[PDB]
Amino acid sequence: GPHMATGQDRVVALVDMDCFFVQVEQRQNPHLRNKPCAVVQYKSWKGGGIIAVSYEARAFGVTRSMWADDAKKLCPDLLLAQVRESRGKANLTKYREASVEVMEIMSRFAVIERASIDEAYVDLTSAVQERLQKLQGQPISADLLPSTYIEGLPQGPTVQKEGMRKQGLFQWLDSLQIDNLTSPDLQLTVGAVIVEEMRAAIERETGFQCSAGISHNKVLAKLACGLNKPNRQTLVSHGSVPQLFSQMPIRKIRSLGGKLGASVIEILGIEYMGELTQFTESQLQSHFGEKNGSWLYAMCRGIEHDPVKPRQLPKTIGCSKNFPGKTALATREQVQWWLLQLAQELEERLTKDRNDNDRVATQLVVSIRVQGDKRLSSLRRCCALTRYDAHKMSHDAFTVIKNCNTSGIQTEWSPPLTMLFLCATKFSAS
DNA sequence: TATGACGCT
DNA sequence: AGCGTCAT
């Protein structure tokens, strides 16, 4: 009863940039602003594959992982920006550099966990305690939360979406609990005020807009962030969880959007995250293993302990390129030349990482996919990485894969390779 | 039809 | 060490 721990100890936020690559291209070319546009890789085959879509283009049905030519059928006016192409492949430097712009601003407020190229988690527990000590005992104005949604509000006893927002926000604040410095709901509100500021700083200093979620753990923050995209942040309180989860498809919770989540649905015979509450921890552990059972048991109650790991920099640096279908590499000269092209971009990126971040990678991993193989990776081998030389790395990458060539005729290469991937890991300080 | 983090064995 | 899962 009192020994019920409710996972309200932390204040955690997930910040995520709205249509990130599109914003980056639109800062650079003002003509793309406020217009249906998408970002594509390559152009010859079907106009290129789309990887990012503005919200105006989304109104027409334009999605990621779609050919530009098909996109132009749903949206004739759609504008396109192309990813920079280097050494025969896509080069994403523009977007990685835009990312450190954002991560460095976010780092001044709290320590972040780089989660992707455009999203970071933030643990605001410490920042919130201090704000509570400066706001003495004085209340929190709705003017401090100009873009915040309180999930599940308004409730109880105006039909444009901004009027709703203030109604729920007023309800939340007018019932707030400012006399207690340990009230979890008051802490989420202070965290939300901090994130409004974080988000105004990112836009002030990059011109990029984002959404955020604020709650007690990474999972809820992440789910919360997506409730009011774009350019809005959503506070998900501990108390909103039973209603929020009662109709939430299990696949929507982070790590349940794949196979494990599908077997939760098929085995247990449920649909929504809330239905998990009727199962005991021992039942769940028998169904899915000690780790999954324990984590499933806590999570449907809104409790999750996976911490915000202080890590602003990737553990891994890698380049890949698919050669699907008839483009599959089928000679020794092809395989070596693309390994060289990949090795060359990787060396460009590693030298920059060494100067910037005072570290060197020590292991090189070569992954390949042969033609006729449902698995995304067919083979993965590693060797030492001792000089940032592209000709050595491509040589070593070949040496460790050459054994995979079926063909007895030595000049050709079978089975044809549909994918090459070089990857620098095992960093050491420098 | 380009990337990164982590678990399991 | 190497494969599998889950995500942006």
Ligand SMILES: Nc1ccn([C@H]2C[C@H](O)[C@@H](COP(=O)(O)OP(=O)(O)OP(=O)(O)O)O2)c(=O)n1
């Ligand atoms: N399968 C993917 C997913 C993402 N990205 C890149 C392009 C995106 O712009 C960026 C961030 O991905 P998101 O999943 O956050 O989606 P967006 O940021 O594009 O838009 P939004 O978050 O508003 O949906 O990462 C990619 O190249 N391939």
Ligand SMILES: [Ca+2]
């Ligand atoms: Ca995003």
Ligand SMILES: [Ca+2]
């Ligand atoms: Ca994202």
